[PDB]
Amino acid sequence: ALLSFERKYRVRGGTLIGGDLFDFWVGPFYVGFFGVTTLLFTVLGTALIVWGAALGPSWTFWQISINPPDVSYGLAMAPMAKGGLWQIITFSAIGAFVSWALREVEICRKLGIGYHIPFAFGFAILAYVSLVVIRPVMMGAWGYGFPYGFMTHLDWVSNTGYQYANFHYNPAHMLGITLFFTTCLALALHGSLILSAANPGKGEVVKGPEHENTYFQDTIGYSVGTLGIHRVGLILALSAVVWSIICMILSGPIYTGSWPDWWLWWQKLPFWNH
């Protein structure tokens, strides 16, 4: 099935690799060679996750967990019953994410638009890789990656954040929190303004950029613009992800001590050291 305006855009070309073989659609989904690879990796990883659930002790969705190999294994590939399944799932997921991003690139090429969307998804892929590959590799063992479970990855988050006394005192983690809260606040403001301009109340006429700028100027003192707000939102989300990656790289590969104790330098400054 097609939309009322899709046939004129469903054109040949735009593939990065594979040529005409995979240039076709199955329903609404564009397939592509990287889509075929995405399906390959998704099916493999999902089947192996269900296999790990079957090997596990419970079939409860919350309690299903695929655990990484023990820290004693180091960076060596582990037996499939002792974390090798986790490693295979990790690399299949990485392949699936990369293939999804490249499929988005192919769709962007076909539609003649920018690559900002795959570029932004690259940051999510980078955060995932840093959590499952980069940080455990610089830490010396695959056991430091989070287990693939609904609750066990939360337990991993809790244990990792309490290994450093209090993760709330990580300076890059504070910046990540600030940018994550600001992204939500800005999203609420942007959606609210656009919906208030498009729906100005029953019996009223749709407003425009003048009114949109005037509203926020009158309320808070300044505005950003029509495209400045989208650029700011993208930069905010990507900066939050980047500072989260930075805090995770600092926590354990570089800094191993207590983050609350890291803040003594502020109290030891020469102009206040009494």
């Binding site: 097609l2 046939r7 004129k8 855009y9 054109v11 040949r12 076709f24 090429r109």
Partner: protein, 255 residues
Amino acid sequence: NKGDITGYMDVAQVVLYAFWIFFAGLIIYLRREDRREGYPLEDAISGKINSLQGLGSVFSIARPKIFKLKTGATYAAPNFKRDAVAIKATRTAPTAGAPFEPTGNPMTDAVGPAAYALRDELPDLTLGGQPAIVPLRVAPTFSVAAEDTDPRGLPVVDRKGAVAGKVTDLWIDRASIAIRYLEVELAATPGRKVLLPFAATRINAKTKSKTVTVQSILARHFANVPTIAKTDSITRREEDKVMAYYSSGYLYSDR
């Protein structure tokens, strides 16, 4: 037995399930709002209204909402105004999911990245009712910031180094202050002027001329840029046509 509703049920679980019900209803409503443009779905080949849908099709498409405009006209969403089934392209395979192959010149035929939406033949209007996008000649009040470089008089060059023309005017937006289009006088056929989107043009910094580089299309494609009826105002349809023609360069420039 603090929060227990029954032997196993409790207040937190009851509130969680209430939120689940509300969130399912909210997803239904959000999809309803999503289906205000482009729906109902048409068959890929025949173009008749036909799709694989369940018992939720009754609630799927909402009643048309009416947007009241300051010009007195109204826009309905969904408007149920479909594009023409026949387009200037032919599928490479008889399957529904097969892609289309342009019959002639895709840039002129407006298929694929060159395709544009049949918007209203009316220019965007500001709060005062005057057209929003006008050349700098018609708007003496506006001026380019002194910290920036005026694109007027700067050569227009493509990705291969071929010069397409010179910038003779700038088209501004009065509603949201910005530069929208650049008026370029083509080197070939002197006196012919074409509109050039600002968002598709980057300045080449220190070139001693700051050539306004256009990576979209080549120099030879500037002669085929769609024209505009008025010399001081541009309609929404012409605007889309120009942006769509320029956006198709990355895919059909070397073809």
